[PDB]
Amino acid sequence: LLKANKDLISAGLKEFSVLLNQQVFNDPLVSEEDMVTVVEDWMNFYINYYRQQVTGEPQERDKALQELRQELNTLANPFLAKYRDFLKSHEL
Structure with a gap:
């Protein structure tokens, strides 16, 4: 809303x-x-923090909740990947 x-x-x-x-x-x-x-x-x-840190209509929260979850889902994807590669590398 704002x-x-x-x-x-x-x-x-x-x-x-x-x-x-x-x-x-x-x-x-x-x-x-x-x-x-x-x-x-x-x-x-x-x-949990965002689920309770919103205002306005329930539609706004629900969108933000999904959009955020999607952002993290993707954002973290390259992190765990680059990490797993970093760990599997220094093995031998």
Whole structure:
């Protein structure tokens, strides 16, 4: 209904964007179980946090909820992939 909504989304967006790019895997470092668990938890906080951090008609929330979930679903796709590759690489 107002920029307020778009601001909340953009805030999560910029949050995940800046946080995602802030991930610099040096060497074999942590296992995928830690990263994966961190990824899952984060998405879960967003879903529950955003589900309750909206205003206006129920249609607005539902759209944002799906659009966000879709954003993360794709956004995270290249992260876990590049990560799995990074881990499988330094094996031998």
